[PDB]
Design a protein around this nucleic acid. Structure first.
Ligand code: SF4
Lengths: 158, 225, 124, 254, 118, 45, 230, 184
DNA sequence: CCCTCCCCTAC
């Protein structure tokens, strides 16, 4: 393995482990899995208003970097109070990583001789109505009748 | 213009140039006015660079911005660059004329019938289990001529009217555009001679047809890359 | 815009012979080198002015422009060969474009902040 | 089944988005887009119809009769043979009406709504009374209200104001846009007609003439293709199409 | 005619990176296509710097215009009736650009129909 | 044959004739009798 | 300030797309030769069809153009995926840019076409690059601006413009000149190669262009990224 | 001068340790808080462990390290394979600073260093669960107990007296298995 | 603002 060094001091072993950390955290009073509550993709929809209903207060925060609280050491947040002092001839580099070659390539690649039933008969009619008044059993006569016996369960093969 | 072949006498025999349609191809489902304007400006640049040398006749196409019905009206007085204002003054139409999709060009006393080809593509898209090759297309053209109509499939080709497609005089030469294959044939129906020419598309296998009016002969010129 | 440009633009271009545009001065240099070949040799004052302009141009960390000018001069000399060769104008121009330019390329490797790492021999 | 298919689809999509992405911004954007589409009128007009069964003989009085009972009685008045069976759903729509008008007063039947030349659905009434209550009930448990999202949302073209109803000429662009719109509408109508002809081929058994007429004779209200064809025909025959043609003629008069 | 068309080609090829066609010389010096083709043939030689990719077309007996791409095996050697340099390309890709050219008097074939305004 | 051989066989022996460009040859006059005849059956309003 | 920004955005988009296509940063199959990319491109610049890549490129171009007043040099950095070494540096020098708040389209597009043609001529002569073994970055050089310090006021966004500004302010990190280059080991030290290219010189837009190439190494540099000899 | 250095070094060390812990499998995912915390205004998500005991232990270790900052030459975090007791990976933060410098320069330098560390950790291969443990080691210049390489250099703070250099080294029996850590 | 009638669903 890799040598620690010519003169290296080793620290104490971590109090927790890979499997006992979740159990200890659950015993401490917090849920094992912190499922993410509904949020806002952009803080423009936050509206900076208290979210409550029927006297129950709801805390909604966005995942955008604008509303994310700074990392705090010892329970106290750290931030810059003095105004920034920009110098002359300063170079800058983009932060967001571009899409990978593999992702683009993958995206391009994809894009009984016994009667045990009941005989059945079906009937339908056609009536020659006058103008648009639908069929009438008093002034309209039947012009066509269509029947179709169900051959699946019809015996005797006549 | 005779710049390539250098044969001035042979090139000068081409009195007129006839564009049969499909100048610009686009999908109407998802298209913006900017790209169509760019394509139309390129076409206008070509026209302005070729109009002084030779007369150009513009015909509507299936995919061009024109009416989807077979009797397509001419393109427009607009949709061209400002350099064509002199050509579009209205008095000078003999060198730049826009006609309807079906027309009878009486070129030097010879009446020829030219269509974009939507009718043939309409019958081709149908499957008839009783009868896509050059010979099959020519037989289809023969049947179309014999039936004395231009669009046998009326619902697919045209929509209502505001019937011109019923032939009243047989043209000397039949011209149909937007066909995968080029073929020529002389026919004799009822003692009358009719020539059928199917000019192919220029985007793929971009060959053109030179129709000689004196001998009724058609020759093909192939352009590669 | 924010009282930091220091000139009409963000940077002050080097002006030679009352010329500002880079393409304009490049065309002027091409015209000068084309007409000077038939004269038997450029004037000493013009060469001194060109050298001063080049050294001022380098001092402002614009070595790309110097490389472009050297490439233009070399291309003009190459394309003037076989037609303007051995008439006492090509030899002196080549000697000047070597001695007063090629050593001048690898000087003042500045980028407004310390010195650029490694070195460069230039395509030239 | 007391609502409409559109509200069911909207609720299902919102619930799925909330359960999967857990991002209320996406839900808000989708709701705003749906509300804008409803207000504009680009809807199928088939998912905005109600389906409630009506019992003619089980109503205490005409005042207490349901909304569908009014439509049933109106259809019975013009023809006594159109008597629905017991517990039979009767489709109906709610068109726009004057302020203070009762919901049962309008009771626009789909047959009357589609045949109506100047009948417009009550976009505001639908958007409020069919979406705000259920979405609020499904979302107030989180701490947000859908009412705020809903409330936050002369001239051929949209110059504020301007004959041809166009201040800036821009002929080469205006005629191109008009041609593009007309071509898109014509292509959609042709595709719809082809689909209807193919569907009617089942009975006609012919793909030529006298089958397209039969295909156009179809008026089935259970198929969205019929509603789309009706909308396309209305768009083609609308006054806006005449205005576009007049503007094209005026611009091409040079 | 020499020392001017050559200079124009040199400028259009190196001062600004753009492929040049013979039609450009027809527009520039108002000379016939044969003279422009002879000028391209003259410029093809006596050039030590091979910084351009010449484009040569082939005019067949059947007027089959073809662009030469392999420059090694051209089919129908005996069927070619004309051969000249179409254009000078500073890179492999051609992608020419076309604009408005004022062909006031550079036409070699003039249509019998004239132009009238108002 | 190589490309250079074809180039020196064809382009070198250029005719350089009938290219005065001062009096260009007139194109064949082809007229359209229906250009001003109108009465187009396929013309719609 | 209206037409100039549009032309600059179009030129930057074409520059980035050509650089990505010709350096094999992304597969050539995704790239398609086209003229319309919602703007009138000067030539048939190959534009990738990946929606995420298109959005990323558009956002990068917009962010660069937003701070173009304080930016005098824009560069595209090509770095190996395996080891963080810059093997190619392409710089779009904005010497003056003629920043005026007060030329048509033909001349500007002609200058852009000439610049892109020169860039293509430079790019074809370069050796081929292996697949899925290269990455590109964006490094800009500024004169007077501080990035990432705008989030110290706990500002709450109320409009899209201010949210975009606060996002662009914190989207850049401070770096140093000649950072990703080799550290001059001394055993046959690498010598960077400088190549000069012509730039657009329109009346409103003045642009200079040049490129950087390692063209050297001391082992473990340019290894298996240049497709062997060819 | 040194006040700003220590104040920002505390946060930088905490963020670096948390990122190293989360991006590797010393502790399981979905046990951190990557949604409601920002390290140095970076767009990337910085995870912080939800367990108060682990955070307190990390803070105590950082404070103890900074107490003897003048006596430590190298500080590193080890990746140890279980049942092997070998340092698979080591992330070393070299110290060469000498005990003026403005606060914003230090802030920007630490931001760039954290960005480089996050970018380097993003492309690291996936590692199986319940197989890796971590340990903090310091090197004395000239509680605590007495004690093939693939070096990858990272950009450190060099804006003045701070000369902190960041680099990592790599190279197990089938522990590394190829498999988007923020998707769960 | 609350009651009554109608509609619909879940166990
Ligand atoms: S409407 Fe629906 S059903 Fe009636 S024809 Fe067209 S498709 Fe077939």
């Amino acid at each position: 393995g890799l040598r620690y060094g010519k003169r290296a001091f080793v620290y104490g072993e971590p109090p927790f482990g890979y499997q006992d950390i979740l159990n200890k955290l659950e015993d401490e009073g917090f849920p094992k899995i912190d499922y993410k509550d509904p949020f806002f993709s952009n803080p423009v929809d936050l509206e900076n208003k208290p979210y409550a209903y029927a006297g129950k207060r709801f805390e909604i925060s966005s995942t955008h970097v604008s509303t994310r609280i700074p990392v705090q050491f010892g329970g106290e947040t750290v931030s810059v109070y003095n105004k920034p002092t920009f110098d002359m001839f300063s170079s800058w580099k983009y932060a967001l990583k571009p899409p990978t070659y593999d992702a683009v390539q993958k995206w391009y690649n994809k894009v009984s001789s016994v009667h045990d039933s009941l005989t059945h008969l079906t009937l339908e009619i056609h009536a020659n109505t006058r103008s648009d008044k639908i069929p009438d059993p008093a002034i309209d006569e039947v012009s066509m009748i269509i029947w179709c016996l169900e051959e699946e369960t019809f015996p005797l093969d006549l | 213009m005779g710049r390539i072949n250098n044969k001035i006498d042979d090139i000068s025999l081409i009195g007129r140039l006839l564009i049969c349609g499909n100048s610009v191809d686009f999908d109407i489902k998802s298209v913006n006015k900017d790209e169509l304007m760019i394509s139309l400006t390129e076409f206008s640049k070509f026209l302005h660079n070729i109009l002084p040398s030779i007369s150009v006749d513009i015909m509507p196409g299936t995919n061009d911005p024109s009416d989807k019905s077979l009797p397509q009206q001419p393109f427009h007085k607009s949709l061209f660059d400002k350099s064509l204002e002199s050509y579009f003054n209205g008095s000078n139409k003999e060198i730049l004329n826009l006609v309807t999709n079906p027309y009878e060009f009486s070129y030097n006393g010879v009446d020829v019938l030219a269509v974009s080809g939507k009718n043939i593509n309409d019958i081709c898209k149908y499957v008839i289990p009783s009868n896509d090759d050059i010979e099959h297309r020519l037989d289809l053209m023969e049947c179309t001529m014999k039936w004395q109509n231009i669009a046998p499939t009326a619902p697919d080709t045209l929509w209502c009217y505001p019937d011109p497609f019923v032939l009243d005089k047989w043209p000397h030469v039949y011209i149909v555009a937007n066909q995968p294959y080029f073929g020529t044939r002389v026919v004799e129906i009822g003692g009358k001679n009719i020539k059928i020419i199917s000019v192919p598309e220029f985007s793929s296998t971009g060959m053109i047809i030179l129709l000689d009016l004196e001998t009724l002969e058609a020759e093909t010129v192939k352009i590669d890359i | 815009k924010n009282h930091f440009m220091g000139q009409n633009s963000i940077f002050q271009p080097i002006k030679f012979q009352n010329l500002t545009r880079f393409k304009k001065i490049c065309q002027l240099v091409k015209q000068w080198v084309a007409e000077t070949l038939g004269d038997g040799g450029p004037h000493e004052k013009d060469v001194k002015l060109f050298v001063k302009y080049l050294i001022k141009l380098c001092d402002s960390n614009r070595v790309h422009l110097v490389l472009h000018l050297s490439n233009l001069i070399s291309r003009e000399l190459n394309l003037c060969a076989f037609l303007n060769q051995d008439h006492s104008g090509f030899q002196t121009w080549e000697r000047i474009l070597l001695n007063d330019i090629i050593p001048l390329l690898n000087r003042n490797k500045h980028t407004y902040q310390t010195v650029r790492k490694l070195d460069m021999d230039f395509e030239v | 089944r007391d609502g409409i298919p559109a509200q069911q689809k909207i609720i299902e999509k919102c619930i799925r988005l909330l359960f999967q992405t857990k991002d209320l911004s996406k839900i808000k954007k989708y709701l705003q887009n749906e509300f804008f589409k409803i207000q504009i009128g680009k809807v199928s007009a088939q998912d905005f119809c109600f389906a409630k069964e009506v019992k003619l003989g089980a109503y205490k009085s005409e005042k207490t009769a349901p909304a569908g009972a009014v439509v049933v009685k109106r259809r019975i008045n013009e023809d006594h043979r159109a008597e629905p069976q017991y517990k039979e759903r009767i489709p109906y729509l709610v068109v726009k009406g004057k302020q203070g008008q009762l919901l049962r007063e309008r009771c626009v039947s789909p047959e009357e709504f589609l045949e109506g030349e100047n009948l417009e659905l009550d976009s505001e009434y639908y958007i409020n009374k069919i979406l705000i209550p259920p979405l609020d009930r499904l979302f107030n448990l989180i701490g947000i209200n859908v009412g705020n999202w809903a409330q936050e949302i002369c001239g051929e073209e949209l110059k504020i104001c301007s004959l041809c109803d166009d201040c800036l000429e821009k002929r080469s662009t205006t005629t191109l846009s008009f041609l593009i719109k007309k071509l898109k509408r014509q292509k959609e109508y042709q595709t719809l007609k082809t689909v209807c002809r193919t569907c009617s081929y089942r009975y006609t058994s012919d793909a030529g003439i006298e089958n397209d007429h039969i295909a156009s004779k179809c008026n089935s209200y259970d198929c969205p293709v019929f509603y789309s064809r009706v909308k396309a025909e209305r768009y083609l025959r609308d006054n806006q199409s005449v205005q576009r043609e007049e503007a094209l003629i005026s611009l091409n008069d040079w | 005619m020499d020392q001017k068309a050559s200079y124009f080609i040199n400028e259009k090829l190196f001062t600004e990176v753009k492929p040049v066609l013979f039609t450009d010389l027809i527009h520039h010096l108002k000379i016939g296509p044969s003279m422009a083709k002879k000028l391209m043939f003259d410029y093809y030689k006596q050039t030590t710097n091979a910084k351009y990719n010449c484009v040569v077309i082939c005019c067949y007996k059947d007027q089959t215009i073809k662009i030469i791409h392999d420059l090694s095996n051209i089919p129908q050697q005996d069927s070619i009736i004309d051969c000249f340099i179409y254009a000078f390309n500073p890179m492999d890709s051609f992608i020419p650009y076309y604009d408005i050219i004022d062909q006031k008097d550079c036409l070699t074939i003039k249509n019998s129909y004239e132009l009238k305004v108002s | 044959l190589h490309m250079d051989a074809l180039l020196t066989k064809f382009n070198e022996d250029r005719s350089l004739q009938d290219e005065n460009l001062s009096q260009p040859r007139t194109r064949v006059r082809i007229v359209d009798d229906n250009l001003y005849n109108k009465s187009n059956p396929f013309q719609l309003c | 300030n209206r037409w100039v920004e549009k032309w600059l955005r179009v030129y930057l988009k074409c520059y980035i797309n050509l650089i990505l296509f010709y350096r094999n940063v992304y597969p050539p199959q995704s790239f398609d030769y086209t003229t319309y990319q919602s703007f009138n491109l000067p030539q048939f610049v190959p534009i990738n069809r990946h929606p995420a890549l298109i959005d990323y490129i558009e956002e990068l171009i917009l962010d660069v153009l937003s701070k173009l007043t304080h930016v005098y040099r824009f560069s595209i950095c090509i770095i190996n995926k395996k080891n963080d070494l810059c093997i190619e540096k392409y710089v779009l020098d904005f010497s003056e840019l003629q920043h005026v708040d007060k030329i048509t389209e033909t001349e500007v597009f002609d200058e852009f076409r000439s610049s892109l043609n020169s860039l293509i001529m430079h790019l074809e002569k370069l050796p081929k690059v292996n697949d899925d073994t290269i990455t590109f970055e964006a490094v800009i050089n500024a004169i007077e601006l501080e990035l990432g310090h705008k989030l110290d006021r706990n500002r709450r966004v109320d409009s899209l413009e201010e949210k975009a500004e606060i996002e662009r302010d914190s989207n850049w990190v401070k770096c140093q000149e000649d950072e990703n280059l080799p550290d001059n080991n001394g055993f046959q030290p690498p010598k960077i190669k400088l190549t000069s290219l012509v730039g657009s010189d329109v009346g409103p837009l003045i642009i200079h262009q040049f490129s950087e190439k390692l063209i050297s190494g001391d082992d473990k540099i340019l290894n298996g990224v240049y497709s062997q000899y060819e």
